[PDB]
């Protein structure tokens with residue numbers, strides 16, 4: 001049940017980033033509307049700048065945590081599938097890769113990491129046995145639709161807001177810009 | 188200050204400007220200045236933008252030195268150490284109100300006029316303001332004005348006044364222009380900026396030239 | 397108009413055009429100063445001006461444009477080039493630029509470029525996606541160059557002896573070790589004129605130092 005709520009929060013901050021993009025685009029369209037007019041005053045121009053840079057930093061970090069939440073939910077679902085499907089049918093996997101398994105079970109650290117390397121190459125061969133083979137596949141059977149709505153590849157806007165990243169000092173100064181933005185909103 | 192310059196100020200700018208001269212005693216300057224600053228703070232209390240111009244900090248400092256009584260303890264150079272707090276009363280009103288309005292002050296300073304007591308007040312007022320502008324005599328000998336010594340000029344947390352990326356842009360320009368001389372920098376800046384109409388075009392031709 | 401034709405011309409023709417263009421006291425100074433002042437007054441009249449040269453970039457990124465005839469001298473004949481041309485037009489160091497030039501405004505000693513018309517004998521547009529020199533994989537001297545004139549010249553014997561002793565090839569790496577008074581200078585000039593006469597397609601130049 002944790003995967004479902006994690007997925008729900010993933011769409012929650014996804015939609016948050018979308019609406020942040022919408023209010024950003026509103027900021028630039030208002031900016032261009034004022035630019036196309038007569039710019040007698042520059043204080044409005046300066047505050048429009050301040051807000052558009054602070055909001056673009058905000059949507060940058062929004063895309064960032066949306067991306068990491070997407071990977072988090074993907075890996076938690078993958079590990080849950082591995083755990084329970086092996087709970088169902090792990091005896092065949094055990095009998096298949098037995099040598100390094102007994103190498104791991106009753107031996108020391110050097111033997112264990114050598115066994116990890118052996119199992120790594122063996123499972124790489126096992127995966128490439130069927131990976132190059134051409135077979136139709138379906139999405140995650142437990143949450144197929146749930147995985148189709150989230151999508152494996154994120155939206156192009158996600159990397160549009162992830163292409164540019166500011167320095168940590170610049171990141172904190174945009175954070176303080178967001179703080180003063182909320183301060184003037186309180187005014 | 189001489190009445191001719193203050194009357195030129197009166198006749199030039201549309202806004203009203205207060206005046207004082209050597210005819211007015213030092214205590215008169217102190218009291219008119221404190222009404223002026225108190226009125227400015229009362230006005231900015233009503234969420235309004237107020238700007239004050241000071242010419243100069245040394246003249247007022249001399250006036251406050253003259254008017255202060257002797258408290259029994261004297262800072263080196265025959266000046267009352269406590270009295271120095273009173274020019275800071277006329278300078279401490281500079282603050283921006285986040286709820287609305289803001290009070291700003293722009294003050295000039297005078298040094299190297301043959302008086303021993305002028306540079307040290309600048310030294311003890313160095314940390315008072317968040318930005319400063321230097322004027323040098325070698326540019327005056329060079330006869331070209333303004334004698335803006337912007338190479339050593341600096342502001343504390345000026346980022347709040349400009350954007351972010353374009354802030355790093357003029358800082359790139361600043362540290363590019365730092366190593367060269369203070370003179371040729373200002374001539375070629377004013378030469379590039381002279382025949383143009385807006386500073387934005389200056390910004391693009393810094394990416395063009 | 398094009399400064400190369402008035403640059404390679406001798407001093408007499410330049411000074412005569414100096415008197416006939418309205419400035420008669422421009423003889424007692426350098427060639428670079430003469431051409432600078434003549435072109436200054438010519439462009440002040442408001443006529444078309446064309447330029448060409450080879451560029452270089454200083455430490456600050458702002459670049460100069462020198463001329464081959466002046467032996468790449470840092471005279472007034474050089475032309476200012478901005479780093480912005482490098483950043484968008486994608487022009488590398490030493491690219492031969494020919495095109496429009498701009499008369500410098502007040503406070504600008506050196507000329508500037510309006511637009512570029514030809515880069516390395518090619519269109520400026522396709523010079524952006526040009527492969528670099530070091531990125532090209534090298535090989536050995538595949539091609540062979542013959543130094544024989546073929547006309548039976550009175551001095552062809554030296555070139556024939558050079559060919560017999562050590563044939564030369566394209567893209568080779570060779571040295572000519574020689575003590576002084578070895579006659580090397582004129583044999584290099586002989587092979588230079590030989591390759592100029594036999595091969596009119598390949599570019600030829602000779603570097604003289606001290």
Ligand SMILES: Nc1ncnc2c1ncn2[C@@H]1O[C@H](COP(=O)(O)OP(=O)(O)OP(=O)(O)O)[C@@H](O)[C@H]1O
Nearest residue numbers: 551553554555574575576577578579580581582583
């Ligand atoms: N093929 C040749 N035909 C006639 N004379 C020759 C030939 N090769 C060499 N010499 C003679 O060798 C001498 C070399 O003269 P030259 O000035 O060309 O030498 P250089 O090596 O270029 O000079 P340096 O080393 O002093 O700069 C001359 O006396 C020249 O006549």
Ligand SMILES: [Mg+2]
Nearest residue numbers: 579580581582
């Ligand atoms: Mg020689």
